[PDB]
């Protein structure tokens, strides 16, 4: 029996197995074909991970079916609202530090009118107002940037905030594996479905091999919620850097390829070329002209893609559990008078005239640069 395997490619290759071949044995076949260790392989068939004790027949794997193989090796402490993608030395998703500077002088002199209460305040530029404490500077707006907090960082050594990743504080089970892991990726679907980073890798890699990522011209190439929820495409596309450099570059390559096509061009059909060509609205002749790159330099029919001629050619239950949201007061740390918290900003100001303590809602300490940096606002 021939089953088709996709292993980091949309190009499936055939594999010979029998009805009684176990998934442990299927993994051994693929391991031998790619020169890879079998223990590091995960078998994904139509969304579900196939376990080692099941046989080909049990998994309803008929003649000429597509399986995926994804290689995967098996007050006191800080609270982190922000996660970043550190490109080095970390080369991974790490908790980060939120920072401010003036839009004008680009210095840490801009004192805010009020603090951020959500991601929109720190992600949309010039949404927050303040006053630059430097004398000769008419700085009215703030500029927020992020830094990896795992090591000591340089001024210009910034990192993209991965606003989806949150530390799993409420111990929410993952939509796919139903386990409690941290951090998690939280989707922007109405149910705010939560997926652990391992399941997320499996979802992206298999979807990439299937060419089942979505193209939106105003966004690019992305994926919605695992559950398929409408209006849930990942907006900040650096989230895919979680997949590691090799998968990310492949995602970027497939995305550019989908972009070309969505624009009506073509990809050069010659072996090993594939140049992104944009012929004029009314053209049947397309020339892969490069001389350097995109040098081929083939002339083909936009239709048949041969040399230019003249004539014609999820579990409902698991999803219910995996939701971000599915007691109102805290006392001031000095006067012990309870204060109701309005919005997401962590900077509390006691309204007690004898007190007026500025404190962190989260930590219950007086307001400082560490609390601003680690968690100015809650998630």
């Amino acid at each position: 029996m021939i089953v088709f395997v996709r292993f980091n490619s949309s190009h499936g290759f055939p594999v010979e197995v029998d009805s009684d071949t176990s998934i442990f044995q299927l993994k051994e076949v693929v391991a031998k074909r790619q020169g890879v260790p079998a223990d590091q392989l995960r078998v994904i068939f139509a969304g579900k991970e196939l376990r080692n004790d099941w046989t080909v027949q049990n998994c309803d794997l008929d003649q000429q079916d597509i399986v995926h193989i994804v290689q995967r090796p098996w007050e006191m402490n800080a609270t982190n609202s922000f996660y970043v993608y550190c490109k080095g030395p970390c080369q991974r998703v790490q908790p980060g530090k939120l920072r401010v500077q003036c839009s004008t002088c680009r210095q840490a002199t801009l004192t805010l009118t009020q603090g951020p209460s959500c991601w929109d305040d720190v992600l949309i530029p010039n949404r927050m107002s303040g006053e630059c404490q430097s004398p000769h500077c008419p700085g009215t707006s703030a500029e927020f940037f992020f830094k990896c907090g795992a090591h000591p960082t340089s001024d210009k050594e910034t990192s993209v905030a991965l606003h989806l990743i949150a530390t799993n504080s409420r111990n929410i089970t993952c939509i796919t594996c139903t386990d409690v892991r941290s951090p998690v990726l939280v989707f922007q679907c109405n149910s705010r479905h939560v997926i652990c980073l391992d399941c997320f890798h499996l979802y992206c890699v298999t979807r990439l091999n299937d060419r089942q990522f979505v193209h939106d011209p105003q966004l690019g190439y992305s994926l919605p919620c695992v559950a398929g929820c409408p209006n849930s495409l990942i907006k900040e596309l650096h989230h895919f850097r979680i997949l590691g450099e090799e998968q990310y570059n492949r995602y970027q390559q497939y995305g550019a390829e989908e972009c070309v096509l969505q624009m009506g061009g073509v990809l050069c059909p010659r072996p090993g070329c594939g140049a992104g060509l944009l012929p004029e609205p009314d053209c049947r002749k397309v020339t892969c002209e490069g001389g350097n790159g995109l040098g081929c330099g083939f002339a083909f029919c936009r239709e048949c893609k041969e040399a230019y001629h003249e004539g014609e050619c999820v579990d409902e239950r698991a999803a219910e559990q995996a939701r971000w949201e599915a007691k109102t007061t805290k006392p001031c740390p000095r006067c012990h008078v309870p204060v109701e918290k309005n919005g997401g900003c962590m900077h509390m100001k006691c309204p007690q005239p004898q007190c007026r303590l500025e404190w962190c809602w989260n930590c219950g300490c007086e307001w400082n640069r560490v609390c601003m940096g680690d968690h100015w606002f809650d998630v």
Binding site: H238, Q252, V260, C268, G276, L278, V286, T287
Partner: protein, 76 residues
């Protein structure tokens, strides 16, 4: 900062750039290296066509990130 520009052909162009540099400036920096007029050039980042008036910060393109180069051909 350094950025890369890759054709789907496999050609990699090395550019020296700033996050404030527009796509128009980036297209100009490609012409200064490869002699490709910017009206022929079309840049893509993460599957999104980059517009001339926007900057590198606006698409969040980082130090050592790659853009895809695709070409409008006439005459185509």
């Amino acid at each position: 900062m350094q950025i890369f520009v890759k054709t789907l052909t496999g050609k990699t162009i090395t550019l020296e750039v700033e996050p404030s540099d527009t796509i128009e400036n980036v297209k100009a920096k490609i012409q200064d290296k490869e002699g490709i007029p910017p009206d022929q050039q079309r840049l893509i980042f993460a599957g999104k066509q980059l517009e001339d008036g926007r900057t590198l910060s606006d698409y969040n393109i980082q130090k050592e990130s790659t853009l895809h180069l695709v070409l409008r051909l006439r005459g185509x």
